[PDB]
Design a binder for this molecule. Structure first.
Ligand code: NA
Length: 302
């Protein structure tokens, strides 16, 4: 994870420019829906300029920051990947549902997560990794005890530390867990990524069982969708009140949104308030609102 300097930063901007040009091609019909790479990359540029501005005079400090070195390396890696993706996908980049354009969507989410992480760790351009506030108290305690005030830890150490408190049953569960928590796909877990995961799958006391029940095996789980995609999916069940699904939002990391069909044949969306998703779904079934996950007749018991 190499030391960041002007020329690395400038190479980043040159690579980001190339991705921008690639995604401006009109034959992609690139829709504006979040995550929208054409906004994300300028926004990442602006926040990086802000960081560099704050560390004028102190460029040694910034460039030795462990979190920043890993972040910039990952940013260079993902933009190169995006550039390669275009070079080899060739004509299929213009097929809306091709596998190379589903890969572009996937990279677009990662750019979104990376920007969000960078803003959580460098609010206003100043490094605050070591004072980051973890939302759930049992999770904050776990981080502070295993990792102190580290901002980022390699996946292997994170897995080992977490296994001792929340046993992971197999190599396969470990990989699936890595895919859920390692939002930036850089083989590290930041305190920001750990915040998001423990918020989504609280209560801490049953952490991984909540994750299995909500995001591994639940037919209601949609992973990342927009409001509009949720509505369009539930439109097909407007005749079936009680049909519901739940989603993550790339613009509101760490919270759930539930969409459901009303007895009156409308679709409403609710954000779980001061309860875990787990409980909002139990209450929602009890009250007759969340009965048919993705329209299916069998609803998991929680
Ligand atoms: Na990561």
């Amino acid at each position: 994870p190499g030391t960041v300097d002007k020329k690395m930063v400038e190479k980043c901007w040159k690579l980001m420019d190339k991705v921008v040009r690639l995604c401006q091609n009109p034959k992609l019909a690139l829709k504006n829906s979040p995550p929208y790479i054409l906004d994300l990359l300028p926004d990442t540029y602006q926040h990086l300029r802000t960081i560099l501005s704050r560390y004028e005079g102190k460029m040694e400090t910034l460039g030795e920051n462990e979190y920043f070195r890993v972040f910039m390396e990952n940013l260079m890696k993902k933009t190169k990947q995006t550039i390669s993706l275009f070079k080899e996908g060739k004509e299929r980049m213009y097929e809306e549902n091709s596998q190379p354009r589903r890969n572009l969507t996937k990279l677009s989410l990662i750019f979104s997560h990376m920007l969000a992480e960078l803003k959580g760790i460098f609010p206003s351009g100043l490094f605050q990794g070591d004072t980051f506030r973890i939302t759930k108290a049992d999770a904050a305690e776990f981080w502070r005890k295993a990792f102190g005030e580290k901002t980022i830890v390699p996946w292997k150490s994170f897995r080992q530390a977490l296994h001792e408190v929340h046993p992971i049953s197999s190599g396969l569960e470990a990989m699936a867990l890595k895919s859920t928590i390692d939002l930036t796909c850089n083989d590290y877990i930041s305190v920001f990524e750990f915040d998001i995961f423990t918020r989504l799958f609280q209560p801490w006391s049953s952490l991984l069982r909540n994750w299995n029940s909500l995001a591994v095996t639940h037919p209601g789980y949609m992973a990342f969708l927009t409001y509009d995609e949720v509505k369009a999916r539930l439109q097909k069940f407007i005749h079936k009140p009680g049909s519901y699904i739940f989603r993550l939002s790339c613009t509101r990391l760490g919270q759930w949104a539930i969409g459901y069909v009303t007895a009156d044949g409308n679709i409403l969306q609710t954000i779980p308030h001061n309860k875990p998703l787990f409980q909002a779904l139990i209450d929602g079934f009890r009250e007759g609102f969340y009965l048919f996950p993705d329209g299916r007749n069998q609803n998991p018991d929680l």
